[PDB]
């Protein structure tokens, strides 16, 4: 019954065993890669919940300490709430797979990856991604194609390094994680030491060319030990109702998105929604459905905005495709803080504060591979009042932890080593306003607050968040993506860096067809935006303060 599959991923032998462990889950695979074994399980609900209007996908990566031959630290000697590495891995596995479930699928899905053995020499997460791919292949659940994943490094002499170990990553200038399918890249999360855009796109193409072995081995595993495919039928389109609202009350949608004021545009559009629901509420014959006619209109809005963007029309805020929103930059905004910066990009605003301390303030990270001391901490807060809403004021969630790691990824290359600067540093970026990428505003604010506190950072670092809307063979790259546009795009990337090279890159593709040339054009436009922002930043503070802060040890 145990069906074991062995393949070569790079120079590493990967073993994918199914059939023995967890035989009541929809899919369950044990992946052994380089003496790192992870048990990945996928359970899918058999019926959709009544009233379920969203797809409830959950991913839980867990690192059990017994895998490393250790007893958990802490008062209770048991593993507890997810650490930060387990939340970031949970979101690194969640990001690629969610776009690949078919549209209209609303049955609950829960992936649970558990690291059960490790030699402590390599990160256990590319094995959890391989295991998630294999489990979703052998499960039968409606999912689109096997995915693959790979971590890439870069050393000037060797070149790119596939699946670098923890000792290989101590001397490399890149730490990229690329995930994708057989014909498209679906996720990129990377950190770098001022590498050119060419060197950061060659890495994405190297990883894409390298994990095709994972896809081939998960296709053989699915064609050997696969469960029968679920009998799930995608709901059909109301072609008639759509082709109807399109004409009945569609020209007003065109003449409602030509208003740049949010209030006026929203009101005029809302008035149209009501006018047209009533005109053909539900399918015409009975005029029975309610939300149907309201959401067929929401589809004619999405398509209208995209068509306009692609056809070369002013955006929802009147800007062109290459305009960065006006910037207001201030340093020294708080009287008694070591370093402070208020960074505003249009209607996005971040108040970043840098504090310095001694070696006793460093964070003790109890990792699976042992215990480390982190002398840099960037804490990104996103209070609901930044979006004019009421909400929970509690512990940071997955979105804040991931947005703080993107900012830290952007700023990390410039920070001084403990030899150069023997102090702990805690940057705290509070998003006071958000209508865009507040993580990139946190990168800019962090650079400014660190050059204002006196920290000897190598150079000013700025970030820009962009998007791409492809409609057939015509594509448009949008600079400084807004909040409304974040869900309207086909690829939303986020590039941080200095004036010399990229220091972090996050991409999240959703379509097939984004070739290499499109990515080069997008990255060149991101470079020009970043250089503009960096030049406006250098007009306030260009270099670290001559003398350290008045209140710093």
């Amino acid at each position: 019954n145990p069906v074991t599959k062995q393949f070569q991923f790079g120079q590493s032998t990967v073993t994918l065993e199914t059939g023995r462990i967890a035989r009541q889950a929809t899919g369950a695979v044990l992946v052994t890669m380089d003496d790192v074994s992870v048990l990945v399980t996928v359970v899918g609900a058999k019926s959709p919940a009544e009233g379920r209007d969203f797809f409830p996908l959950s991913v839980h990566y867990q690192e059990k300490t017994y895998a490393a031959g250790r007893i958990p630290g802490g008062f209770f000697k048991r593993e507890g709430r997810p650490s930060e590495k387990e939340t970031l891995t949970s979101r690194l596995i969640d990001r690629p797979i969610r776009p690949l479930f078919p549209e209209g699928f609303m049955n609950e899905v829960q992936v649970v990856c558990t690291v059960v053995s490790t030699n402590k020499k390599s990160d256990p997460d590319i094995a959890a991604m391989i295991g998630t791919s294999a489990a979703l292949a052998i499960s039968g659940i409606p999912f689109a194609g096997p995915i693959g994943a790979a971590r890439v490094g870069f050393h000037p002499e060797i070149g790119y390094i596939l699946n670098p170990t923890y000792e290989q990553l101590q001397s490399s200038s890149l730490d990229m994680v690329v995930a994708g399918t057989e014909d498209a890249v679906l996720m990129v999360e990377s950190e770098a030491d001022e590498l050119t855009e060419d060197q950061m796109l060659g890495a994405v193409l190297f990883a894409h060319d390298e994990f095709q072995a994972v896809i081939r081995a998960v296709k053989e595993l699915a064609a050997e030990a696969g469960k029968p495919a679920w009998d799930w039928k995608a709901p059909a389109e109301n072609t008639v109702l759509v082709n109807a609202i399109k004409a009945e009350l569609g020209e007003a949608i065109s003449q409602a998105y030509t208003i740049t004021i949010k209030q006026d545009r929203y009101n005029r559009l809302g008035e149209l929604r009501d006018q047209a629901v009533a005109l053909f509420a539900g399918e015409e014959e009975g005029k029975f459905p309610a939300s149907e006619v309201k959401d067929v209109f929401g589809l004619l809005e999405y398509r209208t905005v995209r068509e306009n963007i692609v056809n070369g029309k002013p955006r929802i805020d009147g800007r062109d495709t290459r305009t960065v929103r006006p910037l207001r930059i201030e340093v020294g905004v708080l009287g008694k803080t070591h370093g402070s910066a208020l960074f505003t990009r249009g209607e996005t605003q971040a108040l970043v504060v840098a504090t310095l301390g001694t070696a006793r303030d460093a964070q003790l990270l109890d990792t699976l591979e042992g215990e480390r001391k982190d002398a840099f901490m960037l804490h990104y807060n996103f209070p609901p009042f930044s979006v004019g809403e009421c909400g929970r004021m509690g512990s940071p969630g997955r979105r804040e932890i991931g947005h703080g790691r993107l900012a830290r990824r952007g700023v990390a290359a410039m920070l001084p080593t403990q030899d150069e600067f023997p102090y702990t540093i805690r940057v705290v970026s509070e998003i006071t306003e958000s209508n865009g990428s507040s993580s990139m505003a946190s990168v800019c604010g962090a650079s400014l607050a660190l050059m204002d506190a006196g920290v000897p950072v190598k150079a000013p670092v700025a970030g820009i968040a962009m998007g791409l809307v492809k409609e057939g063979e015509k594509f448009a790259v949008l600079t400084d993506i807004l909040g409304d546009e974040d869900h309207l795009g086909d690829m939303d990337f986020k590039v941080a860096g200095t004036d010399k090279g990229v220091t972090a890159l996050q991409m999240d593709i959703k379509i097939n067809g984004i070739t290499e040339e499109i990515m080069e054009i997008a990255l060149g436009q991101a470079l020009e935006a970043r250089l503009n922002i960096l030049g406006q930043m250098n007009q306030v503070i260009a270099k670290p303060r001559a003398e350290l802060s008045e209140n710093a040890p």
Binding site: P156, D198, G202, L205, F206
Partner: peptide, 25 residues
């Protein structure tokens, strides 16, 4: 030279394709 200076790595898929395009041609 620093990493930023170095050019297209030899394992870069695009460099391999150019090389095979020269050897084949």
């Amino acid at each position: 030279v620093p990493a930023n200076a170095t050019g297209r790595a030899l394992n870069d898929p695009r460099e391999k394709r150019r090389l095979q395009r020269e050897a084949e041609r």
